[PDB]
């Protein structure tokens, strides 16, 4: 998070803000503001680090950055409020909306898609091809079918050496 001494986004570019009393600097800092003001500083930090034009707020890049800041705020909220179903819904919806944005950014501008993923720490994932319950009967059988395959592979290799050994003896 930005330091508490950080000035608000509105007062950072006023002339002479560095020569005012320390008390006036505290009243214009993040320490004396609500969390929404700290998120505006985070968004601006990501916008200048990532996007080519930090003042274009309607680009697909800026929307992903703005939404990524909201997603982090919901995660922090839910870390303290674990039974808040309303905000749990907003988080899952926001994550899904960001994935849709990333899909559209990957399809249109891959070079920018890569910088967004590096800058925001997003690991893009392709969706599963099928949506179906993995119930106990299927989970157990799939585990057995993988064990059966693994054992069959071992036996097929021990039928290569014995055949190889016998062939050498003939010589």
């Amino acid at each position: 998070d930005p330091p508490p001494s950080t000035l608000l986004k509105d007062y950072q570019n006023v002339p002479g803000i560095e020569k005012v009393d320390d008390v006036v600097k505290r009243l214009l800092s993040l320490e004396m503001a609500n969390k929404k003001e700290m998120l505006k500083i985070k968004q601006e930090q990501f916008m200048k680090k990532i996007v080519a034009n930090p003042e274009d707020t309607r680009s697909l890049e800026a929307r992903i950055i703005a939404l990524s800041v909201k997603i982090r705020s919901y995660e922090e909220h839910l870390e303290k409020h674990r039974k808040d179903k309303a905000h749990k819904r907003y988080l899952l919806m926001s994550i899904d909306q960001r994935k849709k944005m990333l899909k559209n950014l990957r399809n249109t501008n891959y070079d920018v898609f890569e910088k967004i993923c590096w800058g925001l720490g997003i690991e893009y994932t392709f969706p599963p091809l099928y949506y179906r319950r993995a119930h106990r009967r299927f989970v157990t059988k799939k585990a057995l079918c993988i064990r059966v395959f693994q054992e069959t592979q071992k036996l097929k290799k021990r039928r290569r050496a014995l055949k190889a050994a016998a062939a050498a003896q003939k010589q």
Binding site: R137, L144, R147, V148, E151, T152
Partner: protein, 71 residues
């Protein structure tokens, strides 16, 4: 409107709940037997797999779990 369609469903549900009440001990014995066969049918399906793959016994360290018991 009238509620005649609701009334038919009401009586059907009442008689069903009444039938289930009277026979809840027979139905519990029947359900238990079905789950036993269901477990056996599941165990056979897994044994069929390793047998059709050329193995003679279950994969080393494999025990088929009971996936239908209340526990």
């Amino acid at each position: 409107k009238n509620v005649l369609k609701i009334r038919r469903r009401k009586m059907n549900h009442h008689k069903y709940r009444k039938l289930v009440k009277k026979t809840r001990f027979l139905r519990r014995k029947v359900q238990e037997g079905r789950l036993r066969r269901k477990q056996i049918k599941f165990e056979k399906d897994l044994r069929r797999i390793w047998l059709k793959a050329g193995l003679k016994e279950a994969p080393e360290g494999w025990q088929t779990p009971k996936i239908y018991l209340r526990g």
